[PDB]
Amino acid sequence: SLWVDKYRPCSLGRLDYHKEQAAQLRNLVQCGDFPHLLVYGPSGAGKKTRIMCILRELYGVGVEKLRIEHQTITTPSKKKIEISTIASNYHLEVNPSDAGNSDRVVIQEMLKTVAQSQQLETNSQRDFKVVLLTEVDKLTKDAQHALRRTMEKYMSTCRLILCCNSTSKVIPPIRSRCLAVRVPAPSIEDICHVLSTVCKKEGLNLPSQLAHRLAEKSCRNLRKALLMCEACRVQQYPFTADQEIPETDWEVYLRETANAIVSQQTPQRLLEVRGRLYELLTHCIPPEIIMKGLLSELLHNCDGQLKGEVAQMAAYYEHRLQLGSKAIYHLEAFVAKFMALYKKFMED
Amino acid sequence: MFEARLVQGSILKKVLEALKDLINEACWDISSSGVNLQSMDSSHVSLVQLTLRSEGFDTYRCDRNLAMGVNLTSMSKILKCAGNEDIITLRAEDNADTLALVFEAPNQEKVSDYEMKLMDLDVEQLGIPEQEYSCVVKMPSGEFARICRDLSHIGDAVVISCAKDGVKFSASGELGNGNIKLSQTSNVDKEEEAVTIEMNEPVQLTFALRYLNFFTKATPLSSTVTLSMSADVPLVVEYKIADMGHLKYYLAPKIEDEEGS
Amino acid sequence: MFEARLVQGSILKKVLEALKDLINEACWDISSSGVNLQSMDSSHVSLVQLTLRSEGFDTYRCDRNLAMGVNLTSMSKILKCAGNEDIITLRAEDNADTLALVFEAPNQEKVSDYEMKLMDLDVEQLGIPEQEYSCVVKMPSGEFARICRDLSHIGDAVVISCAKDGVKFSASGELGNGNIKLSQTSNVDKEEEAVTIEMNEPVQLTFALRYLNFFTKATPLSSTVTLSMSADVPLVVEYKIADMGHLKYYLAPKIE
Amino acid sequence: YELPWVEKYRPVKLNEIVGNEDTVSRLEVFAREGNVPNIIIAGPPGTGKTTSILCLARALLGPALKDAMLELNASNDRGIDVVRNKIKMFAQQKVTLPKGRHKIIILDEADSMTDGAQQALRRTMEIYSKTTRFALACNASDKIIEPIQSRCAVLRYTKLTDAQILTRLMNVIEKERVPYTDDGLEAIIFTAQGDMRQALNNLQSTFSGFGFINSENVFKVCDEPHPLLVKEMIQHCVNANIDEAYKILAHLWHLGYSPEDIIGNIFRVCKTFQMAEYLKLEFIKEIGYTHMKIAEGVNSLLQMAGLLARLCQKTM
Amino acid sequence: NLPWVEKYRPQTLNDLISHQDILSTIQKFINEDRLPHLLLYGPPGTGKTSTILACAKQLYKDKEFGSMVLELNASDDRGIDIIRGPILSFASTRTIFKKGFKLVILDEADAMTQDAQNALRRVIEKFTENTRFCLICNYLSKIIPALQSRCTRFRFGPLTPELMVPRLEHVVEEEKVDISEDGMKALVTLSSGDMRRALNILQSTNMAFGKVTEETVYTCTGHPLKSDIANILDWMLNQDFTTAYRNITELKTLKGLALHDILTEIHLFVHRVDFPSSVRIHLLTKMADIEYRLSVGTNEKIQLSSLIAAFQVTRDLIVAEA
Amino acid sequence: SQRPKQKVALLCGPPGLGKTTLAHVIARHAGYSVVEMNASDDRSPEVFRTRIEAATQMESVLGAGGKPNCLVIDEIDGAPVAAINVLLSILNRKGLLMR
Ligand SMILES: Nc1ncnc2c1ncn2[C@@H]1O[C@H](COP(=O)(O)OP(=O)(O)OP(O)(O)=S)[C@@H](O)[C@H]1O
Ligand SMILES: Nc1ncnc2c1ncn2[C@@H]1O[C@H](COP(=O)(O)OP(=O)(O)OP(O)(O)=S)[C@@H](O)[C@H]1O
Ligand SMILES: Nc1ncnc2c1ncn2[C@@H]1O[C@H](COP(=O)(O)OP(=O)(O)OP(O)(O)=S)[C@@H](O)[C@H]1O
Ligand SMILES: Nc1ncnc2c1ncn2[C@@H]1O[C@H](COP(=O)(O)OP(=O)(O)O)[C@@H](O)[C@H]1O
Ligand SMILES: [Mg+2]
Ligand SMILES: [Mg+2]
Ligand SMILES: [Mg+2]
Helix, strand or coil: CCHHHHCCCCCHHHCCCCHHHHHHHHHHHHCCCCCCEEEECCCCCCHHHHHHHHHHHHCCCCCCCCEEEEEEEECCCCCEEEEEEEECCCEEEECCCCCCCCHHHHHHHHHHHHHHCCCCCHHHHCCCEEEEECCCCCCCHHHHHHHHHHHHHCCCCEEEEEEECCHHHCCHHHHCCCEEEECCCCCHHHHHHHHHHHHHHCCCCCCHHHHHHHHHHHCCCHHHHHHHHHHHHHHCCCCCCCCCCCCCHHHHHHHHHHHHHHHCCCHHHHHHHHHHHHHHHCCCCCHHHHHHHHHHHHCCCCCCCCHHHHHHHHHHHHHHHHHCCCHHHHHHHHHHHHHHHHHHHHHC | CEEEEECCCHHHHHHHHHHCCCCCEEEEEEECCEEEEEEECCCCCEEEEEEEECCCCCCEECCCCEEEEEECCHHHHHCCCCCCCCEEEEEECCCCCEEEEEEECCCCCCEEEEEEECCCCCCCCCCCCCCCCCEEEEEEHHHHHHHHHHHHHHCCEEEEEEECCEEEEEEEECCEEEEEEECCCCCCCCCCCCCEEEECCCEEEEEEHHHHHHHCCCHHHCCEEEEEEECCEEEEEEEEECCCEEEEEEECCECCCCCCC | CEEEEECCCHHHHHHHHCHHHHCCEEEEEEECCEEEEEEECCCCCEEEEEEEECCCCCEEEECCCEEEEEECCCCCCCCCCCCCCCEEEEEECCCCCEEEEEEECCCCCEEEEEEEECECCCCCCCCCCCCCCCEEEEEEHHHHHHHHHHCCCCCCEEEEEEECCEEEEEEEECCEEEEEEECCCCCCCCHHHCCEEEECCCEEEEEEHHHHHHHHHHCCCCCEEEEEECCCCCEEEEEEECCCEEEEEEECCCCC | CCCCHHHHCCCCCCCCCCCCHHHHHHHHHHHHHCCCCCEEEECCCCCCHHHHHHHHHHHHHHHHHHHHEEEECCCCCCCHHHHHHHHHHHHCECCCCCCCCCEEEEECCHHHCCHHHHHHHHHHHHHHHHCEEEEEECCCCCCCCHHHHHHCEEEECCCCCHHHHHHHHHHHHHHHCCCECHHHHHHHHHHHCCCHHHHHHHHHHHHHHHCCECHHHHHHHHCCCCHHHHHHHHHHHHCCCHHHHHHHHHHHHHCCCCHHHHHHHHHHHHHCCCCCHHHHHHHHHHHHHHHHHHHCCCCCHHHHHHHHHHHHHHCC | CCCHHHHCCCCCCCCCCCCHHHHHHHHHHHHCCCCCCEEEECCCCCCHHHHHHHHHHHHCCCCCHHHCEEEECCCCCCCCCCHHHHHHHHHCECCCCCCCCEEEEECCHHHCCHHHHHHHHHHHHHCCCCEEEEEEECCHHHCCHHHHCCCEEEECCCCCHHHCHHHHHHHHHHCCCEECHHHHHHHHHHCCCCHHHHHHHHHHHHHHCCEECHHHHHHHHCCCCHHHHHHHHHHHHHCCHHHHHHHHHHHHHHHCCCHHHHHHHHHHHHCCCCCCHHHHHHHHHHHHHHHHHHCCCCCHHHHHHHHHHHHHHHHHHHHHHC | CCCCCCCCCCCCCCCCCCHHHHHHHHHHHCCCEEEEEECCCCCCHHHHHHHHCCCCCCCCCCCCCCCCEEEEEECCCCCCHHHHHHHHHHHCCCCCCCC
16 A cells, blocks of 8 residues: 555644644535635645545544445437546545536536435534535536525535645636635645655655755655655665655756757757657647646756747747647647757857 | 307317417407418418408407417417317407317316417408319328328429319329329218319329328318319318318418429 | 239238237249248248138239238338238239339228338248148147246247146246246137147256247237157147248247 | 529539639549449638539439439437438448439538538448448548548548639629629629639629629628728838838728728738738738637727737848 | 517518618619528627518418528528438429429528538539528528638628608607607617517516606616716726725626626727827726626626726826826 | 356458458357447447347347357447447446356
């Protein structure tokens, strides 16, 4: 069993970072009229830790007894779509963004179905029940309009906890009626604290300097930090400060992509780097993640008078990739513009 | 003050089942001569005129004329509350939003009061002129209903031709052809089963079969149907509603393109 | 020129009240002996052969042997136009693209002159040999429709076991089992209500109830039905249509 | 009750069609021979796909056309039961036909049919091809599946070159003795844009509307933005002049023109404008971007002003 | 009583004005029986339904109007079903009374899919000598080019103020309202050549403020006056960023103006200003960027300060050019 | 029960290579009477169910056995999901699929 999820907290008092938000949420769920929640922050900050912790504090013992159900829905076109559901006897958890263009269909039908379902022995447990919408940000406009309709009509019997990142694409009038809970990414010292705790439980003597290296290469992402710690334990048990940390294959692939860019400024190297971009894109990783990795591994090389225009073109081609439908044209346009600007930079 | 009593009760039900799917809203024009109705389909192809005379009702009295908007689906449900032998008394006010129908048992044991809410409609009274027809054919009601019910399986249209041999109903569809002939019958023991044809000029016209299938749900109203057909004249389907009035239909014929092949 | 005239019109309705649901299309082959129909279903399991002789038609004229492919769902809407006592006459030319059916009333008030379009089809002649069957059961046809429709709910397949105690129809399914026994009835007032079992060896076989429900739409054709079953030949359901022809169903066995 | 010129001057034989000369000649070779393969005809509207398929079916069948030819169209219902029943039992039927002549199912506007309709189409056209041959007509081949274009022979009809449109237009005009001006007839070409039925209807319409066929009458009965005004607008955008082009913009906006038609005529004039090739590419990209601004729902005068500003700044 | 828009629908080909060519061509078509299928396209509220209804009532009597005219629009469900329903069933049949062609009047015809347009254009070809269609639409560009190749297209265009005043004067004469000299100018400017908005805003400020002036209709409609836009552009070209931003946000909060109307009036004001050409190119580019920027749902104050920002760059440029 | 672990074939690819021709000549090569199917031609669950237990799961009516049949379903890429569900429920039964 991995220690990333084995030593996960259960109660709100055994949290390692953001104690004040933990106390605020504990006193919020201590009284009645628990409102609609919109939890947000960066990836790996620990939103879902707060969410199952809130579910632990809201209910009794049976909060981690989860199972997968499969529910079929019908589009206006005659086609059956099977959707997945992570559910318990006290709550619901749905990812509704897996259905791309039929997100309004599932957002109407599935929560109409669970709203029309009656809580058996409702006097014993609590007043209402909670529904998690795990990936909610990339839902489209009228899907989120049906979502706020669902929030309005079953306000007495079904409150929702929407979890996402980058709420700019989340519509305004769902943010008005939802209590906004913001979970920041843990700092370098809090990541070092929880790494030292997860090593002290498992009989380990991690030096502080290697914990700083793990925190600074995890880029404020605790799950990735604990996975690096696990992989470092697998690689070598005697821990030295000068330790080779096993970085993930797509980051070092982006590093090789970036040094293939800065090596040559010719169309043949552009063909090679377009092949590398295709190999990166075929693994179903998001192109904004590729863009961010390219800019992070690109700013370690370029001169100080050229970082600003490079960053502006990075934002420009990420935005036009979001407006478009095929990623490789905008990505290789960004790479071609960077090569043209760099060869103008060293040519003069 | 509109009080109108009708002893034979299921004849209004058959009148309504004739209007049941062919038209969804209609206006009742009420005068001292009685009840009048003139409406069209939503497609504006078929015209329906329904006339119920004053003397056919049991006790009819009506001080002022009444233009009355009716949804025939609502009283299609309300006249299904009426029995076959029940007595129907219609009641309305001069400025009513309401309509009252009282269904009475023949032994005066069961009394029923039913209310319908009325809707406003703009009425265009299309004055039908009196025209002489080239062909007038009276035939059984069940026979004509069977004629359209068989010929609606072959195609969507019928070619009806009236000539010196008689009347011919034709159809041509993807399954094949169909031609049913009817001749003038000299002697029947009953006057309700004979086909009798009066003519000036042989005619030939094409009609949609959805409309004729909607028309021939008025079969139990009258035992005999009068089809008045002529060139440039619609297909008049007259049912004589006993001695209390008449139900008349008007179908425009279809366009037939002329081909040399 | 082919021209066949038939006085009892409704028997052709009884004949095709069950043929519109088994086979969507069928071939009529015309010879001086009469009119035959040997046809297969779409899934190569059930065969039908229908024979209507020339003696039972009051007017029959077949100059040359003819093959006409008739859509059996395009003909049923030319069939529902019939009265029960109407007179049916069928005509076709020697180069027939069409097939004419002419109806008259019992009082001859109306003359119907329908004419359907024929169709071209691949033709195969599957010669059924002459074989002895181990079990032959003469049984009422209305009861045969009843038994097929009552084990319609029980399952999807049937097992028939004919042995010395009689014939046994068994169906199995999620609702349970339905088992029936019919014995050799000794004394009946009418011969049509009797059951006559001729046996050589006890025979147990399995078939499909959907096709048997399709078979038993021919219950107004005759008051009796012959069930002929043996070890490996398919099940034969025989309806002797009046004194003028016969209708013959072959149903292939299921695999166990 | 005179017939319109679209149906009156329809061709009756296959050599009167001026659309695609090699395809028409091969269709006539197949009409005289008989064994016509499964064909699909694609292209813009008005090229004459319907009259080519109709003339091929007529010259094949002749007197057996009323039984050996099934024309299924867009105004008829084309559900799953229709391709299950009507097309199937037309393809299963027998017609006494000659040695080379074959049954024809004219499937006009096949791009508007549903997916299950084409799913029931494919087996039918592969199996019954010994008797019936499918002659599909369509506008865009993208809405039709690739297997149907595979089992058919695809015949791309080009947009008509203006010369053959002129030859047919002198044929119709000499058939009617309608007076004309030359530049008005070129205006009828400009209003056509490869749509020959549109050229005939606009000429028809215009003569019935106003006597002499002159640029003023056709541009009055059509009321598109004038080519001279939009061409002078693009010319004023070439030499970096926002103001002189904006008087033309205010002239075309106070005349009540919708922005969609303004940007469409802007692109259509910019297609054939005599300027530098890379400059034309940049202009077409900016006109396309403003056309997405229009199509997304921003139809202000300021979007036209910003289009003019972007065309002005792209010329230094 | 009713609103003035429904009380004065021109019932006669005499009452309507500023559409005399459409009048002359359609009456010339209908007297000699050469009327083709019609496609009436233009802005909203310029009288598309009124002229075709008055023409259909000119042809037929009231006692035969029900069997020779069928009216449909997008209030009903529209698509592939109702083209195969009432429309061709009306079109394929004859007349119940007398003889002549029929009429189908389809209001707001640009709201159907192109499959429905293909079905309808084939219906138009199939039955022409007995049916004359009339399709009223707002935008021509939503209609397939073959459908425009069937029916002749008529452009109504704008309602010019010099033939928009006297109908408003006539409804002023029939219904007594307190209206000053600026009332007609504000009615013909504020309604944007749409006379349905003119008689709706006339009833709105008659019911609301009683008297009709420039100030009453501009405060009821919420439009900014020319003095307001002059003050806004004076603050943008005169004051610094804090003072101009504070002035315009105070004015926008007090008067309830909207940034889209401010942008439109500012654009119609820029070409009055004798800006240098590059500065005007900069202004039109940035203002078109802002008007696309409001269309997605951005915060209005930030785009307001963006407009102030662009005008601050321009004032630095004009002083640097001076 | 003597069936292969791969019960059903799923040949796929671009149009116009000869998958149907290969399947037909291999069925004629392996002693099978050919029988075809279009899936979205009859798109309801019930008719698909009737054909899926009629084309397979049956013997032959001809003579002393004759030759069997193997079902060749075409165009099930566009079949409605209930038809593939019926085919899966008839494939996963453990009355048994034999052809
Ligand atoms: N090549 C041509 N030569 C002569 N007349 C033509 C030609 N193409 C079209 N026409 C005329 O234009 C009319 C309409 O042609 P159609 O074949 O109906 O157009 P289409 O190819 O079907 O395009 P659609 O159906 O509108 S997408 C015909 O009736 C002819 O009068
Ligand atoms: N030329 C005109 N002369 C007089 N009144 C007019 C004129 N044009 C419009 N109107 C008035 O405007 C009212 C509305 O006209 P409509 O024809 O309904 O508008 P429309 O052209 O159909 O635009 P829609 O329906 O919004 S697409 C009419 O009832 C008239 O009172
Ligand atoms: N060896 C061959 N030589 C020539 N023609 C062949 C050969 N094999 C098959 N064909 C023909 O080419 C076609 C084979 O493709 P098909 O199997 O019918 O279509 P497909 O490959 O299944 O692709 P789709 O998706 O069904 S269009 C048929 O028309 C055959 O008659
Ligand atoms: N106090 C803590 N103790 C141990 N692990 C923690 C603590 N807080 C966060 N984590 C770890 O950080 C990871 C954050 O993942 P998650 O909750 O899914 O955040 P996100 O939803 O933003 O990806 C979890 O896997 C969790 O194990
Ligand atoms: Mg066409
Ligand atoms: Mg209107
Ligand atoms: Mg295939």
